[PDB]
Amino acid sequence: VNPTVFFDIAVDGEPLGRVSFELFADKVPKTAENFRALSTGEKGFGYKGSCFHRIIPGFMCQGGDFTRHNGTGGKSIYGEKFEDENFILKHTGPGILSMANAGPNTNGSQFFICTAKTEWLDGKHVVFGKVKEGMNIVEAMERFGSRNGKTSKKITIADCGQLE
């Protein structure tokens, strides 16, 4: 029942591989639906063509800023921001998909894929999905990050949509 969404990842325009995510629509329906719709683009805007602007190896890969491409932009399907839905799910290890924000109830479109357990984020960031296939591709993406988060090559979502 939970939707599966895919990203095709490119590195300076070269196809790298595919990551798919299960979205926990059973537990965070409003948050999962925002990401699902942004991945299909069915509302007229979304993640296709956007970049991962911040990659910190051993911590996380951050993306979803499709309007300013640098961490200052993005927007949800529900308006500029929306509320923290709940904190049922925790940051239990690599592969967790969680919402970036700017304080309480400031979710937009930015997200991060954890590449480590990040328990200090529990109760502050809304967890809403997990990598299903292609964790090895995320690990490959990590090699283009750096300590301050700047990437050495342009990491883009070349295509994205729903699988199931």
The residue extents of the domains of the chain are 1-164
Helix (H) or strand (E) holding 22, with range, is strand 14-23
User: What is the CB-side half-sphere exposure of residue 95 using CA atoms within 13 A?
Assistant: 15
CA nearest to 69, candidates 164, 131, 151, 162: 151
- Specify the CATH number of the domain 1-164: 2.40.100.10
Method used for this model? X-ray
For residues 158 and 8, is the Cβ–Cβ distance under 8 A?
yes
Q: Residue 159 burial (CB < 10 Å; 0-12/13-18/19+)?
A: middle
Distance CA 134, CA 21 (A): 9
* Residue 123 identity: G
User: What is the CB-side half-sphere exposure of residue 162 using CA atoms within 13 A?
Assistant: 16
One DSSP character per residue, 96-117 reads EEEE--SSTT-B-S-EEEESS-
Q: What is the dihedral of CA 22, 129, 139, 122, to 10 degrees?
A: -160
CA nearest to 78, candidates 30, 147, 138: 30
* Catalytic annotation, residues: 54, 59, 62, 101, 112, 121, 125
